[PDB]
Amino acid sequence: CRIERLNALEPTRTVRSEAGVTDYFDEDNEQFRCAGVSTIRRVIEPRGLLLPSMSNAPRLVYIVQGRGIVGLVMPGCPETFQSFWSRDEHQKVYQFQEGDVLAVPNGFAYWCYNNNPVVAITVLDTSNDANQLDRSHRQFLLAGRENILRGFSTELLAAAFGVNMELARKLQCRDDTRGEIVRAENGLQVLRPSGFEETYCSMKIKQNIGDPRRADVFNPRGGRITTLNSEKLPILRFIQMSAERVVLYRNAMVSPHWNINAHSIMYCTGGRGRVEVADDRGETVFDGELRQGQLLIVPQNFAMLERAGSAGFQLVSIKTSDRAMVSTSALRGMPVEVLMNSYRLSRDEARRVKLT
Amino acid sequence: CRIERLNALEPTRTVRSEAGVTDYFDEDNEQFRCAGVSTIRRVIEPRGLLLPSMSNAPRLVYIVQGRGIVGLVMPGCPETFRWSRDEHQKVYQFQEGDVLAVPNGFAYWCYNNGENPVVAITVLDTSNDANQLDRSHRQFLLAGREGSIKENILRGFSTELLAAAFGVNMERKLQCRDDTRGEIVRAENGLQVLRPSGMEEETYCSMKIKQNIGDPRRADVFNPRGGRITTLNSEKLPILRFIQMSAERVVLYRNAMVSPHWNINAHSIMYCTGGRGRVEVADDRGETVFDGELRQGQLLIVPQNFAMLERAGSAGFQLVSIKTSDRAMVSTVVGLRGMPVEVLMNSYRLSRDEARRVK
Amino acid sequence: CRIERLNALEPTRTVRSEAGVTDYFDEDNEQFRCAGVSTIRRVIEPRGLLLPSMSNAPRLVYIVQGRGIVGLVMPGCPETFRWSRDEHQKVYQFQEGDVLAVPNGFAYWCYNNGENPVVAITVLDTSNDANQLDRSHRQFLLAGREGSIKENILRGFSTELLAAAFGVNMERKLQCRDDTRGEIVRAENGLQVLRPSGMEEETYCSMKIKQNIGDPRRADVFNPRGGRITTLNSEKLPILRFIQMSAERVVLYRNAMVSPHWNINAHSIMYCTGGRGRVEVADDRGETVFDGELRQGQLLIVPQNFAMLERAGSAGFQLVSIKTSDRAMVSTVVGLRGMPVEVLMNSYRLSRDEARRVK
Amino acid sequence: CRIERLNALEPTRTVRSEAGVTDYFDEDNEQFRCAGVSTIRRVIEPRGLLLPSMSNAPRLVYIVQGRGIVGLVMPGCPETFQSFWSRDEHQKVYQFQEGDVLAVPNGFAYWCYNNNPVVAITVLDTSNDANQLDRSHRQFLLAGRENILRGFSTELLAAAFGVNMELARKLQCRDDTRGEIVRAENGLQVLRPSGFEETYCSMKIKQNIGDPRRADVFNPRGGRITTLNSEKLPILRFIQMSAERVVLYRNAMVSPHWNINAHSIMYCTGGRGRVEVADDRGETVFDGELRQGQLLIVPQNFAMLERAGSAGFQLVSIKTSDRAMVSTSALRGMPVEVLMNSYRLSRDEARRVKLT
Amino acid sequence: CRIERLNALEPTRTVRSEAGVTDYFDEDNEQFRCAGVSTIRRVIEPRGLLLPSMSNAPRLVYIVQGRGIVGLVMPGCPETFQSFWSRDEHQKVYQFQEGDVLAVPNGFAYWCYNNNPVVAITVLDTSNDANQLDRSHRQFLLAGRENILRGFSTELLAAAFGVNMELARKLQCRDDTRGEIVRAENGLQVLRPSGFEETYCSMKIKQNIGDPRRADVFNPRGGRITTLNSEKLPILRFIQMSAERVVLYRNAMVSPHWNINAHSIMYCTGGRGRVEVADDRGETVFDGELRQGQLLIVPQNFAMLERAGSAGFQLVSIKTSDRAMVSTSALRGMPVEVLMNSYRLSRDEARRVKLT
């Protein structure tokens, strides 16, 4: 993580699937490497069901496109969803929407069903604290392929489940050829409507950040930002990650800054803009136009600047700390002569600098 | 706090402002007293505007009906929201079934930006650790104001001072000396602020302050035969960690009933937004203490450890339950099922097959 | 809480159930009052069984004599304990000198599984932060029941409801309507549960709830000439962190004495399990407030900052000290030895050699 | 820590001693390596005294066999044990027993005296947080050999202690030839009976986990488990480790699972059983019988299964987090059609799966 | 960080400056390396102004010599210093003195002005938690050289600031040839006298540790010590570092010890003394006289001993934990026979050992 030049990123292992495609971003990129994370962009056109797995790294998922339904399983917590002995029982379900962020902790089983094609981006802190495995991404697929039970032998596994050895193989999903997402032919109904678990079991898991009616900052000529973090999502006090949704208009520029306490992982959901970034050397490492569908990793302490083109700049900042922070009004706080002497400015230029 | 009876309780005291009504449940009410809370139903016509005022108590507020804005400002946090507009702190756009968290000495203005009227029932913890002073509701009116009518604060300051204090001309306006429109006045030609629609760091500041809980797609339980339960606590909204109030929204489909239970860490303040339904409550000495039907628009406080039982009607039953701790909890009797079988047989003298019939 | 005298205090009120006696120390007792606690001695014959009941207060319980089970259940935690047996939550096997932590609105049943009778003296914090409501002991009787005798809770619920609530036939048993055996009934042909002997995730659930403190091999101090002190606080049992009670078991060999000291962060509730010994206590205005001998089976509350002095007898002295905070502390006068020497000479007008004689 | 195959482990440096033997487990094993710990099995037949040292890594010790007496020294804490100026004074002592767990934090001086031969196993989180030294095991022996004072010169050290230079050498233990444990010829009496320190100084240090009267889970046909962690041992909120004691009967099988938030370090104290373990690849990495006296490292997220032979399976799980967790009732919480579609099962097989 | 021998350290990259000189300590020294920090000794003779930068690592600065004035900028916090629209406004300023410690967190902008030549030493935990960049020292100079804005292009930057492209270049400080510190010709007045920010914004930042009227320990024949840490400086609960000021007189020796929970970074401000240090091997790694102006790194768990020469030994211990600790009264707490048998001592030598 001593970088000469910044690149913009695009998935480097695309894998196709029955109800989607998996565009992996490869992490051996020194950028990703220095970042210490992975991201995975993945699409599930309708009826599609992504196979419940669990990942090495705790993960944030932002729903780039559309409504849907996601499912996460928290051990020791009782299935609070029932009908009618029983017709069905299962965990709580979460019906997500266009622009929610989803927080998945390690060794936890997520899955979601495409209730337009759902598009959503996902990052995994491979350098997180509770990834006591290696510094990589390990999905432990429960189903499909092998899935985790592959290495479990039928002989043992039947009595584990307490049933025939025939049925067990059908859980090995050996001949399965549909990957992480599947077509749900005959649809897929889950029980939707229309005690210690009141606390630890029922803690919120996604937040809709794209709601411009939720913005944190906002200029009408023009832009907006909102921050997702532990002050808004309790689970986030724990994931050591936080989210930013910056939407800028025509010729908007964000007050320059550097991230005090995190890297920043910039993915453009739309609009176009040049981004300029310089390192501690002062020399410029990055400088380029960013457009829809594109990834820039912008790290810690380094200095960043952006303005949208004539079409806009809609994006999503993921960072590596429970409340990541930028320092913009960085110079508006020094005494002016400090500015003067540090630059060789008269007063007026010092004051002009501080006051626009 | 040794009360003998529970009764459906209602705004004993009501006052229309100019753009809405305030429906005051009693303060020194035995229940409320031992409850250690104060509460209110407020209503706001469209265009109607609730006065700025900070309250002694942590306003947890529930927007039953209507939509709009509420503006809370966190002084010391930089206002975050040329042709024609000003600046000010971020403002908050509520909806039906929203929960709103307003602390103490925190300020909040409220405006009805369209549609129908807005009604929010409020709960104020008048005995919180933060409630210094005494156990009433103190509402420090920033603005405005037969019998004893309040005033805003600035009338308690001399003009020259005030004038000298603010550098505005010494020509009264601010004491709100003539006004009468109440804590809810109206903004006839609309009110515009800095809102998103167009079209064509902060840490302790960015915190969320509202969380929609009326939404069905959110409920945590579905179904205790047969409604749904949505539960707000610090595990969903991090401010509660400091307010030490919790919230339940609970819609019971017809015929239904919620399991017998008692609030471990909690007094419960429950009220009927709608539907029609029964509640049965008891105490230590064995006898019940509430055998009566709760209809919409009626308040009932269910206390700690008191075991309680409800049952919906055919028009359903839809209550809202606000509780007194950041993570308030109840014990689902059924959740009993943890005592050993002989422990069930010896206590009540039943044979085994009875024991399991309950477990 | 300006009390003038301390006296050895005893169960003013006693009641035999059917399988044991309850020995009630007063509630509104000045001491107890300003102490902000309630307490009890309970006794249980073999086979005897304490009723399920949750208490308003955090039951810290001390098993002086006997062994057995206590079953606490943490609702929401999955019961963790075919031919012939049921299921239920894990149960807890106590012994002499055990400390038992039972919260509020927490349920606990207690059974004497052999040997001699069992006697546990209980301390209930009736003014905890968790004690919502008022400052008495409220015991919510799950089961069973001249003057005002309590009942269990379910009698406060109508049958059909109840019946409809539970899906059991409408044929009374559960209100405990005829019963009389008291909160301690007996299980004549034994009681069997799911215990280990044979032979041939949970986080907030797995927490420990008891910790043996009577064991000598545990004491922390040996010896202040000449007994031993074992000390239970959140640094040994993590629940206390939430109960905010602490515990001292202190066996004084004959002739001995414990250093003069006062409870910093603590009221002390001390009681004589055995032995024979003296206690001297004082306050602010200088004069003593307890000059008297404490024999076995007698309670004395030693308050905060009050400085205290004890001395064993020849039959020894063996007390148990339960205190009111998760980490309650005392100041060993000797631990004085930190004031500078001249600071000792000027205060009491002594020459240096006196000063050091104390230090 | 990208493993192809799991092995079962056996100490790799056995060193003999006057009152015992030290069977070290060598940590350059990629398993141990990926684990990031060390373990040391060590025996002290009676009268034996193990030399007070301090270790790099904070350590958990489980007393496999027998009662005894252990001693730990907490700086700044006053010797609360006295007699009679004085005859003796010293720290509190802890008389341990068959099956206690002992928690030793870093840079802290433990020692114990064999009051049957005492057998006890010890693990050291070499990757812990406060091991700011290298990623290895460093015992800093106070006595014996050299011991820590070896490099201290007599000339300086005497006046340090404030005594003759003759006596100092006898603390160098130069000619000492008895290692970490010693025979206590003339026995060894320590004062046993038969204020800010009431808190920070007196926090409990061992727990008896083997007490089947302490089990957390229990089936009478048959098995039991108990968990030792910060909810039972306060010190454990700090050591970033927790303990599990699983005892299974005839043909008992533990509900499969993976450790969410830790590795698991399986040592068999008795009984025999096959253990089956598979990685994220699904492929099987482990599969083998485990018997008394044997070590298996089972990591994070990976999936494990075991049943005892006809003789039993008694063991002790040490894991690397203050409250390590497994996720078993992992599938009993998905909605059934999820299971169906993820495996291609009708309902009945889905429901049979969930309900046995 | 497996060391054979300890060296004493002296800056290895000295760089000269208009109002000072920068004597860098180079961290690729395995000592520094194993330490995982950097230190920088830097002088600012009067009128001098060191350029506001921000460093990779959070930093402690101890003012070896003289009074002065330091300035630190905390984003989101309003300039609480004003005059008179406005004549000047800026952050709070801190007028430091001979022997204060200064705590600078990452991605935060410090600077100070020489109000005798000011001398002060600075350490940077390069291995800290929120240095998510590499394991090195990155100063991000705001001004001077390039400074952070170098890589920012004039074209963009003017409208960023909202002003001419002429003035912007003068912020690039391209032709600047005065480095990190500058002469303040025409002096440098800053507004000195003679709400959520009452808490998070106003938390103390320096403490005067050299005040012998502040010592923690003290023998009049002779020595003194004081500890600076989170019990005295709240910010220090966060920096994961703490400070010790040991002053010893004629022939003073400090009670031997090892640091339980940190390394120790010894810099001599004066006086002279031999220091003796041994590793876990027992063998001696260090042994040498330390004099004014000299650095010794003394790590974790290792054992240390020092006495002053006839001139004294004044120094400053910086360590890597919010409340670093030493264990001295390490043997005064074992039972005596333990000592006896562990060394082969009679009673008297055991008791003599414990009682002097």
Instruction: Provide the 3-class DSSP secondary structure of residue D89.
Output: strand
Q: Are E214 and E208 in contact (CB under 8 A)?
A: yes
Shortest distance between the Cα of E198 and any Cα of chain B, in A, equals 9
Answer whether C touches D (≥3 Cβ pairs < 8 Å).
yes
- Give the nearest partner residue to E134 out of A2, A256, A341, using CB atoms: A2
DSSP assignment of D303-341: EEEEEEEEEEEEEEEEESSTT--B----STTS-HHHHHH
And the tokens for B159?
């003009």
Place of tokens 């489940």: A161
Q: CA D162 to CA D89: how far, in whole Å?
A: 20
Shared domain for B172 and B268, answered yes or no, is no
Interchain CB contact of A170 with D (< 8 Å): yes
Query: Looking at CA atoms only, how far is residue D216 from chain C in angstroms?
Result: 7
Choose the closest CB to A199 out of B211, B217, B329.
B329
Please report residues of B whose CB lies closer than 8 A to that of C179.
348-349
Single-letter code of the amino acid located at B195: R
Helix axes D347-354, D336-343, angle to 10 degrees: 120
The DSSP-derived string for E262-320 is: S-EEEEEEEEEEEEEEE-TTSSEEEEEEE-TTEEEEE-BS-EEEEEEEEEEEEEEEEES
Residue B64: CB atoms within 10 A of its CB come to 18
Measured from the Cβ of residue A213, the count of other Cβ atoms closer than 10 Å reads 13
- Number of structural domains (chain E) is 2
Give the D window 32-71 contacts with E, CB below 8 Å: 49, 51-52, 54, 56, 71
AA identity, residue D195: G
d(CA A122, CA A318): 10
Same domain, B45 and B119: yes
C-alpha span between E115 and E49 (Å, rounded): 9
- A237 shares contact with chain D (CB less than 8 Å): no
The minimal CB distance from D73 to the residues E299, E321, E334 is found for: E334
Closest-approach residue (CA) in chain A for B79: A217
Q: Do D133 and E345 touch (CB under 8 A)?
A: no
Amino acid at site B230: T
By CB neighbour count within 10 A (0-12 exposed, 13-18 middle, 19+ buried), where does E281 fall?
middle
Q: Where are the alpha helices (DSSP H) in E130-235?
A: 154-161, 165-172
Cα–Cα distance measured from residue C20 to residue B358, given in angstroms and rounded to the nearest whole number:
28
What DSSP line would sit under B106-124, residue for residue? -EEEEE--SSS-EEEEEEE
B25: left (phi over 0), alpha (psi -120 to 50) or beta: beta
Q: Do D34 and D154 share a structural domain?
A: yes
- In this structure, are residues D21 and D185 in contact, taking their beta carbons and an 8 Å threshold? no
DSSP C228-292: EEEEESTTT-TTHHHH--EEEEEEEPTT--PPPEEETT--EEEEEEEEEEEEEEE-SSSSEEEEE
Residues E234, E123 within the same domain: no
Is there a contact between D205 and D238 (Cβ–Cβ < 8 Å)? Answer: no
In the numeric block, which tokens belong to residue D7? Answer: 């092995």
Which among A302, A356, A310, A295 has a CA at the least distance from the CA of A327? Answer: A302
How far apart (Å, rounded) are the C-alpha atoms in residues A109 and A77? 13
Please tell me which of the candidates D280, D284, D330 has its beta carbon nearest to residue A139: D280
Distance CA B184, CA B180 (A): 10
What is the Cα gyration radius of chain B?
23
**CA gap E297, E131 in Å, rounded:** 21
End-to-end alpha carbon distance in chain C: 34
CATH number at residue D46: 2.60.120.10
- Non-local CB neighbours of E354 within 8 Å, separated by 6+ positions: E331, E332, E336, E339
Q: In the numeric block, which tokens belong to residue D242?
A: 């927790």
The burial class, CB within 10 Å (0-12 / 13-18 / 19+), for A45 is middle
Q: Is D200 on the interface with C (CB under 8 A)?
A: yes
Structure tokens at A297: 């990793």
Q: How many CA atoms lie within 13 A of D98 on its CB side?
A: 8
Chains D, B in contact, 3 or more Cβ pairs below 8 Å: no
Chain C, 332-351: which have a CB under 8 Å from a chain D CB?
Answer: 332, 335
Are residues B243 and B290 in contact, defined by beta-carbon separation less than 8 angstroms? Answer: no
- For A:269-298, CB contacts with D below 8 A are none
Alpha-carbon torsion (E278, E282, E285, E286), positive or negative: positive
Dist. CA A313–CA E318, nearest whole Å: 47
Rg of chain C's alpha carbons, rounded to an integer? 23
Instruction: Note whether A265 and A37 are within 8 A (CB).
Output: yes
Query: Quick one: which of A102, A112, A94 has its CA closest to A209?
Result: A102
d(CA C45, CA C118): 7
- Indicate yes or no: CB of C154 within 8 angstroms of CB of B282: yes
Question: Which is it for the CA torsion E174, E178, E181, E183, positive or negative?
Answer: negative
Contact flag A196-C78 (C-beta cutoff 8 Å): no
Of E133, E139, E151, nearest to A278 by CB-CB distance is: E151
My answer on whether E79 and E126 are in the same domain is: yes
DSSP string, B130-181: S--S-SS--EEESS---------GGGGS-HHHHHHHHTS----TTTT-S--S
Question: Do E and A make contact, counting contact as 3+ CB pairs within 8 angstroms?
Answer: yes
Q: Which residue of B has its CA nearest to E75?
A: B201
Contact A163, D353 (CB under 8 A): yes
Given an 8 Å threshold on Cβ–Cβ distance, is B286 in contact with C73?
A: no
Provide the 3-class DSSP secondary structure of residue E33.
helix
Q: Based on the domain organization, do A43 and A115 belong to the same domain?
A: yes
What is the least distance, in Å, from the CA of B324 to any CA of chain C? 9
Q: Which residues of D touch C219 (CB under 8 A)?
A: 193
Distance, first Cα to last Cα, chain E: 36
Residues of chain D contacting C80 with CB distance shorter than 8 Å: 216-218
How many angstroms separate the CA atoms of A161 and A153, rounded? 12
**CA B162, B167, B168 angle in degrees (round to 5)?**
80
Cβ–Cβ gap A108/D333 under 8 Å: no
Are B191 and B234 part of one and the same domain?
Answer: no
Residue D47's nearest CA partner among D111, D118, D113 is D113
Quote the CA–CA distance of C13 and C15 in Å, as a whole number.
Answer: 7
Q: Which of E65, E63, E81 is nearest to E73 (CA)?
A: E81
CA distance E273 to E312: 7
Please indicate, yes or no, whether residues D186 and D310 belong to a single structural domain of this protein. no
E169 to chain A, minimum CA–CA distance in Å?
Answer: 10
- Measured CA to CA, the distance from residue A149 to residue A156 in angstroms comes to 11
**Do residue B200 and residue B286 come from a single domain?**
no
What gap in Å lies between CA A126 and CA A115, rounded to an integer?
30
**E148 vs chain B: nearest CA distance in angstroms?**
20
d(CA B131, CA B56): 6
Residues of chain A neighbouring E184 (CB-CB closer than 8 A): 337, 341
CA atoms lying within 13 Å on the CB side of residue B278: 17
Q: Is A70 exposed, middle or buried (0-12, 13-18, 19+ CB in 10 A)?
A: buried
Contact across the interface for E197 and B76, Cβ inside 8 Å = yes
| Whether D201 contacts chain E with CB within 8 A | no
Please give, one letter per residue, the 3-state secondary structure of chain A.
CCCCCCCEECCCEEEEECCEEEEECCCCCHHHHHHCCEEEEEEECCCEEEEEEEECCCEEEEEEECCCEEEEECCCCCCCEECCCCCCEECCEECCCCCEEEEECCCCEEEEECCCCEEEEEEECCCCCCCCCCCCCCEEECCCCCCCCCCCCHHHHHHHHCCCHHHHHHHHCCCCCCCCEEECCCCCCCCCCCCHHHCCCCCCCEEECCCHHHCCEEECCCEEEEEECCCCCCCHHHHCCEEEEEEECCCCECCCEEECCCCEEEEEEEEEEEEEEECCCCCEEEEEEECCCEEEEECECCEEEEEEEEEEEEEEEEECCCCCCECCCCCCCCCHHHHHHHHCCCHHHHHHHHCC
- Are the Cβ atoms of E300 and D182 closer than 8 angstroms? no
SS3 call for D4: coil
CA dihedral E164, E169, E171, E176 (to 10 degrees): -150
Beta strand A100-104 with A206-208 is: antiparallel
Is the previous residue joined to C226 through a cis bond, with omega within 30 degrees of 0?
yes
Q: Is B3 on the interface with C (CB under 8 A)?
A: no
Note whether E216 and E259 are same-domain residues.
Answer: yes
D77 touches chain E (CB under 8 A): yes
> CA nearest D354: which of D326, D327, D331?
D331
Boundary of a domain, candidates A165, A193, A209: A209
List the subunits that have 3+ CB pairs under 8 angstroms with A.
B, C, D, E
Beta bridge pairs of residue C53:
C141
Angle between helices D154-161 and D165-172 (to 10 degrees): 110
Question: Among B13, E156, B279, B59, which residue's Cα sits nearest to residue A286?
Answer: E156
D248 to A149, C199, D251, D257, D315: CA distances (angstroms): 23, 12, 8, 16, 9
**Residue that is last in its domain, among A187, A209, A231:** A209
**List of chains touching B (3+ CB pairs within 8 A):** A, C, E
Q: What is the 3-state secondary structure (H, E, C) of A160-210?
A: HHCCCHHHHHHHHCCCCCCCCEEECCCCCCCCCCCCHHHCCCCCCCEEECC
Q: Which domain holds residue C265?
A: 214-359
How many whole angstroms separate alpha carbon C25 and alpha carbon D178?
61
Q: How far is A355 from chain D (nearest CA, A)?
A: 46
CA dihedral of C46, C48, C54, C56, whole degrees rounded to 10: -70
Among B187, B213, B239, which residue terminates a domain? B213
Closest CA to D127 of D262, D247, D256: D262
CA C59 to chain CA centroid, Å, is: 7
Which residues does chain A have within 8 Å of residue E108's beta carbon, measured at their own beta carbons? 260, 327
The answer for residues whose C-beta is within 8 angstroms of residue E220's C-beta and 6 or more apart is: none
Rg (CA), chain E: 23
The answer, for A129 touching chain E at a CB cutoff of 8 Å, is: no
Same domain, B53 and B169: yes
Given a contact cutoff of 8 angstroms between Cβ atoms, the answer to whether A283 and E146 are in contact is yes
Which tokens in the block code for residue B250? Answer: 């609970």
Nearest residue of C to residue D259 by CA position? C201
Which residues in chain D touch residue A159, judged by CB atoms under 8 angstroms apart?
A: 253
| Cα–Cα distance for residue pair D183/C297, rounded to 1 Å | 48
Q: Which DSSP string corresponds to C220-240?
A: SBB-SSS-EEEEESTTT-TTH
B288-295/B184-186 β-pairing? unpaired
Distance (Å, rounded) from C-alpha A273 to C-alpha A253? 9
Mutate to test the interface with C, among B285, B311, B323 (most CBs of C within 10 A): B285
Q: Hey, what are D11's tokens?
A: 């100490």
Task: For residues E24 and E39, give the distance between their C-alpha atoms in angstroms, rounded to a whole number.
Answer: 7
Among A76, A196, A201, whose Cβ lies nearest the Cβ of C201? A76
Helix (H) or strand (E) holding D278: strand D264-278
Q: What share of chain C is helix, strand, coil (3-state, %, to 5)?
A: 10, 35, 55
Task: Please indicate whether, in this complex, the C-beta atoms of C79 and B346 are within 8 angstroms of each other.
Answer: no
Mutating which of A221, A341, A345, A353 best tests the E interface, going by the most E Cβ atoms within 10 A? A341
Q: b/e per residue, D5-32, with b = 16+ CB within 10 A?
A: ebebbebeeeeebbbbbbbbbebeeebb
Do residues D102 and D61 lie in contact, with contact meaning Cβ atoms separated by under 8 Å? Answer: yes
C108 and C182 assigned to the same domain: yes
Query: Does an H or E element contain B280, and which?
Result: strand B268-282
CA separation, residue B201 to residues A272, B75, E74, E176 (Å) = 26, 15, 9, 31
Interface residue E263 vs chain D (CB under 8 A) = yes
Tell me how far apart the alpha carbons of residues D49 and D113 are, in angstroms, rounded to a whole number.
4
The answer to whether D31 touches D7, Cβ cutoff 8 Å, is yes
Residue among A105, A11, A115, A26 nearest A61 (CA): A105
